[PDB]
Design an enzyme around this catalytic site. Structure first.
Site, PDB file in Angstrom:
ATOM      1  N   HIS A  66       0.609  -1.117   0.031  1.00  0.00           N
ATOM      2  CA  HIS A  66       0.141  -0.160   0.195  1.00  0.00           C
ATOM      3  C   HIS A  66       0.817   1.307  -0.030  1.00  0.00           C
ATOM      4  O   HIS A  66       0.481   2.353  -0.006  1.00  0.00           O
ATOM      5  CB  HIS A  66      -1.049  -0.150   0.958  1.00  0.00           C
ATOM      6  CG  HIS A  66      -2.329  -0.147   0.668  1.00  0.00           C
ATOM      7  ND1 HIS A  66      -3.311   0.578   0.170  1.00  0.00           N
ATOM      8  CD2 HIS A  66      -2.943  -1.432   0.304  1.00  0.00           C
ATOM      9  CE1 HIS A  66      -4.335  -0.026  -0.360  1.00  0.00           C
ATOM     10  NE2 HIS A  66      -4.313  -1.244  -0.209  1.00  0.00           N
ATOM     11  N   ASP A 130      -8.322   4.411   8.534  1.00  0.00           N
ATOM     12  CA  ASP A 130      -9.643   4.745   7.932  1.00  0.00           C
ATOM     13  C   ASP A 130      -9.671   3.558   6.996  1.00  0.00           C
ATOM     14  O   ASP A 130     -11.051   3.098   6.609  1.00  0.00           O
ATOM     15  CB  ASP A 130      -9.638   5.758   6.822  1.00  0.00           C
ATOM     16  CG  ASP A 130      -9.412   7.115   7.840  1.00  0.00           C
ATOM     17  OD1 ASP A 130      -9.653   7.179   8.823  1.00  0.00           O
ATOM     18  OD2 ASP A 130      -8.844   8.134   7.337  1.00  0.00           O
ATOM     19  N   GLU A 243     -12.983  13.038  12.658  1.00  0.00           N
ATOM     20  CA  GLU A 243     -12.278  13.721  11.468  1.00  0.00           C
ATOM     21  C   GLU A 243     -12.862  14.915  10.942  1.00  0.00           C
ATOM     22  O   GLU A 243     -13.915  15.203  11.340  1.00  0.00           O
ATOM     23  CB  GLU A 243     -12.165  12.331  10.416  1.00  0.00           C
ATOM     24  CG  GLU A 243     -11.146  11.220  10.833  1.00  0.00           C
ATOM     25  CD  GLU A 243     -10.563  10.376   9.979  1.00  0.00           C
ATOM     26  OE1 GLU A 243     -10.132   9.257  10.462  1.00  0.00           O
ATOM     27  OE2 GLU A 243     -10.926  10.553   8.602  1.00  0.00           O
TER      28      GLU A 243
HETATM   29  C1  LIG Z   1      -3.360   1.822   0.389  1.00  0.00           C
HETATM   30  C2  LIG Z   1      -3.771   2.842   1.439  1.00  0.00           C
HETATM   31  C3  LIG Z   1      -2.912   3.255   2.654  1.00  0.00           C
HETATM   32  C4  LIG Z   1      -3.409   3.457   3.676  1.00  0.00           C
HETATM   33  C5  LIG Z   1      -4.837   4.138   3.669  1.00  0.00           C
HETATM   34  C6  LIG Z   1      -5.767   3.960   2.490  1.00  0.00           C
HETATM   35  C7  LIG Z   1      -5.108   3.330   1.581  1.00  0.00           C
HETATM   36  C8  LIG Z   1      -6.262   2.802   0.373  1.00  0.00           C
HETATM   37  N1  LIG Z   1      -5.228   4.656   4.916  1.00  0.00           N
HETATM   38  C9  LIG Z   1      -4.586   4.990   5.738  1.00  0.00           C
HETATM   39  C10 LIG Z   1      -4.908   5.527   7.139  1.00  0.00           C
HETATM   40  O1  LIG Z   1      -6.191   5.693   7.123  1.00  0.00           O
HETATM   41  N2  LIG Z   1      -4.123   5.591   8.173  1.00  0.00           N
HETATM   42  C11 LIG Z   1      -2.663   5.214   8.122  1.00  0.00           C
HETATM   43  O2  LIG Z   1      -2.333   5.507   9.132  1.00  0.00           O
HETATM   44  N3  LIG Z   1      -2.262   4.894   6.988  1.00  0.00           N
HETATM   45  C12 LIG Z   1      -3.152   4.446   5.746  1.00  0.00           C
HETATM   46  N4  LIG Z   1      -2.645   4.053   4.694  1.00  0.00           N
HETATM   47  C13 LIG Z   1      -1.046   4.032   4.583  1.00  0.00           C
HETATM   48  C14 LIG Z   1      -0.459   2.468   5.227  1.00  0.00           C
HETATM   49  O3  LIG Z   1      -0.344   2.555   6.682  1.00  0.00           O
HETATM   50  C15 LIG Z   1       0.771   2.473   4.501  1.00  0.00           C
HETATM   51  O4  LIG Z   1       0.683   1.957   2.981  1.00  0.00           O
HETATM   52  C16 LIG Z   1       1.756   1.504   5.113  1.00  0.00           C
HETATM   53  O5  LIG Z   1       2.756   1.171   4.709  1.00  0.00           O
HETATM   54  C17 LIG Z   1       0.785   0.075   5.416  1.00  0.00           C
HETATM   55  O6  LIG Z   1       0.550  -0.581   3.949  1.00  0.00           O
HETATM   56  P1  LIG Z   1       0.973  -2.264   4.065  1.00  0.00           P
HETATM   57  O7  LIG Z   1       0.495  -3.036   4.999  1.00  0.00           O
HETATM   58  O8  LIG Z   1       0.662  -2.536   2.542  1.00  0.00           O
HETATM   59  O9  LIG Z   1       2.766  -2.074   3.916  1.00  0.00           O
HETATM   60  P2  LIG Z   1       3.781  -2.110   2.716  1.00  0.00           P
HETATM   61  O10 LIG Z   1       3.388  -0.759   1.919  1.00  0.00           O
HETATM   62  O11 LIG Z   1       3.705  -3.260   1.914  1.00  0.00           O
HETATM   63  O12 LIG Z   1       5.336  -1.736   3.417  1.00  0.00           O
HETATM   64  C18 LIG Z   1       5.511  -0.384   3.973  1.00  0.00           C
HETATM   65  C19 LIG Z   1       6.726  -0.291   4.687  1.00  0.00           C
HETATM   66  O13 LIG Z   1       6.917  -1.050   5.764  1.00  0.00           O
HETATM   67  C20 LIG Z   1       7.812  -2.065   5.722  1.00  0.00           C
HETATM   68  N5  LIG Z   1       7.264  -3.447   6.341  1.00  0.00           N
HETATM   69  C21 LIG Z   1       5.930  -4.178   5.975  1.00  0.00           C
HETATM   70  N6  LIG Z   1       5.716  -5.109   6.734  1.00  0.00           N
HETATM   71  C22 LIG Z   1       6.631  -5.094   7.687  1.00  0.00           C
HETATM   72  C23 LIG Z   1       6.804  -5.765   8.967  1.00  0.00           C
HETATM   73  N7  LIG Z   1       5.892  -6.792   9.191  1.00  0.00           N
HETATM   74  N8  LIG Z   1       7.823  -5.797   9.788  1.00  0.00           N
HETATM   75  C24 LIG Z   1       8.608  -4.726   9.604  1.00  0.00           C
HETATM   76  N9  LIG Z   1       8.452  -3.739   8.475  1.00  0.00           N
HETATM   77  C25 LIG Z   1       7.244  -3.848   7.552  1.00  0.00           C
HETATM   78  C26 LIG Z   1       8.357  -2.342   4.350  1.00  0.00           C
HETATM   79  O14 LIG Z   1       9.353  -2.935   4.039  1.00  0.00           O
HETATM   80  C27 LIG Z   1       8.162  -1.165   3.860  1.00  0.00           C
HETATM   81  O15 LIG Z   1       9.155  -0.212   4.002  1.00  0.00           O
END
Ligand SMILES: *Cc1cc2c(cc1C)nc1c(=O)[nH]c(=O)nc-1n2C[C@H](O)[C@H](O)[C@H](O)COP(=O)(O)OP(=O)(O)OC[C@H]1O[C@@H](n2cnc3c(N)ncnc32)[C@H](O)[C@@H]1O
Ligand SMILES: *[C@@H]1O[C@H](CO)[C@@H](O[C@@H]2O[C@H](CO)[C@@H](O)[C@H](O)[C@H]2NC(C)=O)[C@H](O)[C@H]1NC(C)=O
Ligand SMILES: *[C@@H]1O[C@H](CO)[C@@H](O)[C@H](O)[C@H]1NC(C)=O
Ligand SMILES: *[C@@H]1O[C@H](CO)[C@@H](O)[C@H](O)[C@H]1NC(C)=O
Ligand SMILES: *[C@@H]1O[C@H](CO)[C@@H](O)[C@H](O)[C@H]1NC(C)=O
Length: 479
Positions: A66, A130, A243
């Site tokens: 995401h 959200d 919000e």
């Molecule tokens: C897509 C989006 C994102 C989003 C949202 C609505 C949408 C449609 N609404 C949010 C909200 O209301 N409030 C909020 O705080 N964030 C919101 N988001 C953003 C979202 O938090 C971020 O996209 C976040 O990164 C979570 O997404 P996801 O779970 O898919 O993680 P990722 O993008 O693949 O990775 C992000 C970074 O974190 C590291 N990572 C991922 N998993 C781990 C674990 N298990 N341990 C350590 N690090 C981790 C990744 O390497 C990357 O750097």
């Protein structure tokens, strides 16, 4: 060894899938993708990386991708497909405690599934995002914010303990009582220090229903003052969630209809109100009360506010339906082909003392005369509910606003330029904002983000836990 067991994939389909994200703006091909069946496979990868001289690969942990700007990519490295940890039927990846005071969730688990498992035991996490199709590890690596954060703090303030595999390939259990340095570093730590394989999340007895209100303003001062009133410490007021939204004149009717809250008749009434007042901007507070008694409680709270009379709009829904509200929005938008588009989102925390200035320059200024697609979200947060010892960076003031301008995209270039213009305005106005969900591309910007003291701690933790600088290179901090 891992490749022979079919866990480490180098085929084009695997690498392609791990090369794009929700942002749909940047892309980077990994050399390989790990599909771990157990945490032992992750230990094996990180231990190999730790013990091998001339180890070639950076390592990223894809939650559900995401990320907006490549934070989950490992260019020419290894992306871990975290979701694979939840493939097996047994053992369960989400365990509500025997006494129902917490829930243990795998780092790869999505919050919607955490909700479902919690509700089966009559309980639920207190602090949300959200949108619920995000991973536990992913949001905890950032902060995790929504309308509950003013009173419960972000998701990182609602974690009891974690299992983390560090960049040394060591499995470590951490909390405020044990390995607290790692605990604090990982929370808001942008995946820099290790992978969260399990997080212990605080829960509360689950409310059954939510009274769900939207209040309309044409005056920003009244709008922001009322938000601050609703979220002020007393302990907190009755509201469970607060919000707010901003609507510019040019796309007023469209943007109001796009909330999914107002009927066509409701939209017409608000458009007429804006017209009679010649307002270039309309504002809406969105609030809930979790639960005849509700009627009076709500009336008492609303009586303290200054929204335009006749412009309180009400819904009453099941608690779970409220929490998962955006899922229905995604389904509908994807059917029209309007979900999987570029998302040049701008997210920041703006200090209370400068929010009126931000409104003047951005909502009443830069964004005027444009066709806006996507919500413009603005709401106050209380610094007291954040732990400044954790990696997440916030403004210095007691109250600061989450500002989330969720633009959906010739259009992309215009929107990227517009975001640069907003940031330039803020810098020239001397607004001491912090970005959220954004990655910076040089040292000075990252040092400014954390501040000198927190940066120095961040580096100290990096040397201790990921000295090779392999982890989450898409953050562009140490890579
Ligand atoms: C897509 C989006 C994102 C989003 C949202 C609505 C949408 C449609 N609404 C949010 C909200 O209301 N409030 C909020 O705080 N964030 C919101 N988001 C953003 C979202 O938090 C971020 O996209 C976040 O990164 C979570 O997404 P996801 O779970 O898919 O993680 P990722 O993008 O693949 O990775 C992000 C970074 O974190 C590291 N990572 C991922 N998993 C781990 C674990 N298990 N341990 C350590 N690090 C981790 C990744 O390497 C990357 O750097
Ligand atoms: C949920 O609880 C179960 C216990 O029922 C955990 O399952 C055990 O996990 C360990 C380590 O992964 C294994 O060695 C055991 O074989 C499992 N036991 C059983 C009974 O299956 C599971 O790990 C827990 N999930 C989380 C994320 O904490
Ligand atoms: C964005 O998505 C489109 C599909 O609509 C795809 O063609 C393109 O490659 C994606 N771009 C990036 C950088 O992810
Ligand atoms: C990490 O590598 C070092 C070699 O520098 C080694 O001594 C240590 O045992 C390794 N740790 C793990 C868990 O692989
Ligand atoms: C709002 O936008 C419309 C154009 O769609 C314009 O006719 C109207 O004058 C605008 N109102 C104000 C007060 O700017």
């Amino acid at each position: 060894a891992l490749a022979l067991d079919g866990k480490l994939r180098t085929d084009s389909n695997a690498t392609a899938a791990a090369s794009t994200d929700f942002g749909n703006i940047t892309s980077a091909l990994p050399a390989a993708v790990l599909y771990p069946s157990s945490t032992g496979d992750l230990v094996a990868l990180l231990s190999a990386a730790n013990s091998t001289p001339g180890w070639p690969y950076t390592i990223a942990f894809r939650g559900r991708g995401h990320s907006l700007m490549g934070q989950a990519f490992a260019p020419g490295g290894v992306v871990v497909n975290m979701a694979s940890l939840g493939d097996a039927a047994a053992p369960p990846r989400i365990n509500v405690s025997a006494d129902g005071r917490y829930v243990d969730a795998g780092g790869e688990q999505v919050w919607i599934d955490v909700l479902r498992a919690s509700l089966a035991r009559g309980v639920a996490p207190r602090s949300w995002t959200d949108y619920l199709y995000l991973t536990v590890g992913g949001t905890l690596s950032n902060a995790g914010i929504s309308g509950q954060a003013f009173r419960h703090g972000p998701q990182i303030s609602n974690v009891l303990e974690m299992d983390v595999i560090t960049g040394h390939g060591e499995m470590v259990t951490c909390s405020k009582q044990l390995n607290a340095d790692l605990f604090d570093a990982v929370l808001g730590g942008l995946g820099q220090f290790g992978v969260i394989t399990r997080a212990r999340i605080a829960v509360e007895p689950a409310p059954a229903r939510a009274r769900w209100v939207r209040f309309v303003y044409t005056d920003f001062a009244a709008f922001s003052a009322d938000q601050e009133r609703l979220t002020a410490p007393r302990s907190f007021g009755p509201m469970s969630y607060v919000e707010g939204s901003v609507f510019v004149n040019q796309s007023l009717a469209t943007d109001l209809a796009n909330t999914g809250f107002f009927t066509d008749a409701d939209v017409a009434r608000i458009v007429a109100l804006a017209g009679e007042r010649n307002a270039t901007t309309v504002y809406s507070i969105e609030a809930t009360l979790n639960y005849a008694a509700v009627d009076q409680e709500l009336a008492s709270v609303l009586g303290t506010l200054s929204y335009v009379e006749g412009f309180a709009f009400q819904r009453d829904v099941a608690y779970a339906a409220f929490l998962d509200r955006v899922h229905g929005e995604e389904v509908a938008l994807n059917k029209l082909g309007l979900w999987r588009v570029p998302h040049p989102w701008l997210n920041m925390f703006v200090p209370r003392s400068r929010i009126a200035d931000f409104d003047r320059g951005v909502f009443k200024g830069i964004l005027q005369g444009t066709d806006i697609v996507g919500p413009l979200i603005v709401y106050p947060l209380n610094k007291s509910m954040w732990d400044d010892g954790m990696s997440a960076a916030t403004p210095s003031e007691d109250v600061f606003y989450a500002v989330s301008l969720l633009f959906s995209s010739n259009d992309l270039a215009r929107l990227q330029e517009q975001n640069r213009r907003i940031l330039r305005f803020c810098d020239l106005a001397g607004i001491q904002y912090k970005t959220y969900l954004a990655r910076h591309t040089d040292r000075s910007d990252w040092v400014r983000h954390f501040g000198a003291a927190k940066w120095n701690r961040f580096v100290e933790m990096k040397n201790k836990y990921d000295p090779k600088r392999l982890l989450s290179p898409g953050q562009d901090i140490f890579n």
